[PDB]
Short mmCIF file of C-alpha atoms and ligand atoms in Angstrom, two decimals:
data_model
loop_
_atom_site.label_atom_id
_atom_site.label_comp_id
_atom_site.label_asym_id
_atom_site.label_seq_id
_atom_site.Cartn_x
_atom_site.Cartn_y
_atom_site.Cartn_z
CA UNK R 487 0.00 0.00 0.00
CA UNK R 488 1.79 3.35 -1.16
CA UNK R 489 -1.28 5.73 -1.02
CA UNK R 490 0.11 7.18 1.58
CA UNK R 491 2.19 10.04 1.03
CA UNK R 492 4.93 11.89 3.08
CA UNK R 493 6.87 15.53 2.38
CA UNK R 494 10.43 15.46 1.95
CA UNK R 495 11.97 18.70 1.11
CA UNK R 496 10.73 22.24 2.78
CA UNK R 497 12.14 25.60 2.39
CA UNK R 498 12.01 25.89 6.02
CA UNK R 499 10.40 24.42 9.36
CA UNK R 500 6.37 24.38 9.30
CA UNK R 501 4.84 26.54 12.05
CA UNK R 502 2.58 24.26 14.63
CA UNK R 503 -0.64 23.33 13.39
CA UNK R 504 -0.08 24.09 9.67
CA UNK R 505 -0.59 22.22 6.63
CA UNK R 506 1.70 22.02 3.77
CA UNK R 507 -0.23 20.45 0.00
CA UNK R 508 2.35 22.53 -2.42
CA UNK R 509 3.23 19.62 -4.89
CA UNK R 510 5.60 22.29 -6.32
CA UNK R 511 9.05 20.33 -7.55
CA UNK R 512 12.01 20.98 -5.07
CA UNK R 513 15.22 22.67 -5.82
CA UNK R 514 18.80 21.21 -3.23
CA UNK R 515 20.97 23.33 -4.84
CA UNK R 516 21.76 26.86 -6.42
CA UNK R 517 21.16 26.38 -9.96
CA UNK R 518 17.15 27.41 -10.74
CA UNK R 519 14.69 24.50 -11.28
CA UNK R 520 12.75 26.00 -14.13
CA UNK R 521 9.01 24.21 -15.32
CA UNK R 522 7.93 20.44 -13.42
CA UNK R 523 12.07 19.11 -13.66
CA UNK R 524 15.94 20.01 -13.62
CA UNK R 525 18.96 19.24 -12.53
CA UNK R 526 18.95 17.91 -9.34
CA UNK R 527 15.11 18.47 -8.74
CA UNK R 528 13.27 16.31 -6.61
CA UNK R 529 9.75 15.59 -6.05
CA UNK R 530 8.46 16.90 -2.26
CA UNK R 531 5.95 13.62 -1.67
CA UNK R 532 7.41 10.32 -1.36
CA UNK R 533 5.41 7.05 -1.00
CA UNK R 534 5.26 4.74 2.08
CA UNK R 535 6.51 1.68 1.64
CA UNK A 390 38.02 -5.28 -3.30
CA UNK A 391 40.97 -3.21 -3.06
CA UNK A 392 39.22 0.29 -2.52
CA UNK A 393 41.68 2.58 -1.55
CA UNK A 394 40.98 5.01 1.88
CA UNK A 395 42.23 8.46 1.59
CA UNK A 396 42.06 10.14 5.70
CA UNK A 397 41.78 13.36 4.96
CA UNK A 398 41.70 16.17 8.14
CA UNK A 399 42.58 19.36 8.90
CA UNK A 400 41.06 21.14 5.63
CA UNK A 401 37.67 22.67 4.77
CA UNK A 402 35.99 20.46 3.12
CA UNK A 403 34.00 22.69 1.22
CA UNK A 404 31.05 21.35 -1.24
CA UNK A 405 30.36 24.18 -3.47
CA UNK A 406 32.84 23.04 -6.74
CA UNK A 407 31.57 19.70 -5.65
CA UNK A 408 27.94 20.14 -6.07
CA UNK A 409 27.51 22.84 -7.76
CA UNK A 410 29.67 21.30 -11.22
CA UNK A 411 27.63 19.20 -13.21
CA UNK A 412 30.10 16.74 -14.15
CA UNK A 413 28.90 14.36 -11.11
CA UNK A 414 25.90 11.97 -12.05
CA UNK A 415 24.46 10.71 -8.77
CA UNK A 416 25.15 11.83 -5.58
CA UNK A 417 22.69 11.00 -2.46
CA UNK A 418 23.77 11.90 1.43
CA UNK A 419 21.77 9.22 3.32
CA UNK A 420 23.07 10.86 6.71
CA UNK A 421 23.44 14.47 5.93
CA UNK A 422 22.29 17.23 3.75
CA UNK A 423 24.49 19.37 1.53
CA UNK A 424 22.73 22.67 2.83
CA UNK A 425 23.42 21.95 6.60
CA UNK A 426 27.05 20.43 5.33
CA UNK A 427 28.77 23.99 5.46
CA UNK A 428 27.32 24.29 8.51
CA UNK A 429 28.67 21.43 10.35
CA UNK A 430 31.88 19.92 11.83
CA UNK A 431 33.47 16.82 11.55
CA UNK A 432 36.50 14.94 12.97
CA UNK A 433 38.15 13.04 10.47
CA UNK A 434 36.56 11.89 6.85
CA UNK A 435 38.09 8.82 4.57
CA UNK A 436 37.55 9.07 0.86
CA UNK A 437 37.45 5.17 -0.95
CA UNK A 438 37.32 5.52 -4.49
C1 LIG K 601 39.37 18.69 -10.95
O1 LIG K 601 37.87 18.56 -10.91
C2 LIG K 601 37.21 19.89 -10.98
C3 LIG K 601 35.75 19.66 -11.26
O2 LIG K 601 35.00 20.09 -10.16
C4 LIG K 601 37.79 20.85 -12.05
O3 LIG K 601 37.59 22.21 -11.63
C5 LIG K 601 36.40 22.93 -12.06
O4 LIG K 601 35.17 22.52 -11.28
C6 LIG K 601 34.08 23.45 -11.61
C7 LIG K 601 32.86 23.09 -10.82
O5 LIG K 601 32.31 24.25 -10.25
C8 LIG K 601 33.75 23.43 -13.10
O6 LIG K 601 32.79 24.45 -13.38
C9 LIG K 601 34.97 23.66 -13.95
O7 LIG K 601 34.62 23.39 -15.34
C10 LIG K 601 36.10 22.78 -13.56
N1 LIG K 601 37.31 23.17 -14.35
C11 LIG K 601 37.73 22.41 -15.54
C12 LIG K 601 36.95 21.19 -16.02
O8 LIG K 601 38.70 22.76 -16.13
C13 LIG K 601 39.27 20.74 -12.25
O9 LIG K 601 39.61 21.37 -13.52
C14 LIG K 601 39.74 19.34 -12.27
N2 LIG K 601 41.23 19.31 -12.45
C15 LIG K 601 41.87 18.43 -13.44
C16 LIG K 601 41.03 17.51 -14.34
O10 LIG K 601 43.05 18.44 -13.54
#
């Protein structure tokens, strides 16, 4: 069963009692991460396993 | 079977020409991340190749 999903990558620390459902592709390093992929761009959800 | 161990110490082991050149393929810190890696301190690190 992966239905479940998890986040991954954040620009920074939630606040308490918020909720985070930005699907937006990640970016770990300096170079931009232009349209849905680039270098080094990962996908925030991952699946449970 | 013969990997050899490189102890390097007493440096910076800085990551920016590391990560930032795109001649590297795939490169995955299981442990640590590369943006709290400048950030951090470490005693003594082999390199196997
Ligand atoms: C040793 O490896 C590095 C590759 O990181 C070479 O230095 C430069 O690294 C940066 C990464 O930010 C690249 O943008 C440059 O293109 C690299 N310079 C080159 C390819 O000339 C360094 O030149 C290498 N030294 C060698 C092969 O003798």
């Amino acid at each position: 069963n992966y239905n479940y999903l998890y986040r991954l990558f954040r620009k920074s620390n939630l606040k308490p009692f918020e909720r985070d459902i930005s699907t937006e592709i990640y970016q770990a390093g300096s170079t931009p991460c232009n349209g849905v992929e680039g270098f080094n761009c990962y996908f925030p959800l991952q699946s449970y396993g | 079977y013969a990997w050899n161990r490189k102890r390097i110490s007493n440096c910076v082991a800085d990551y920016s020409v590391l990560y930032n050149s795109a001649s590297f393929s795939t490169f995955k810190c299981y442990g640590v991340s590369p943006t709290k890696l400048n950030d951090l301190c470490f005693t003594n690190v082999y390199a196997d190749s």
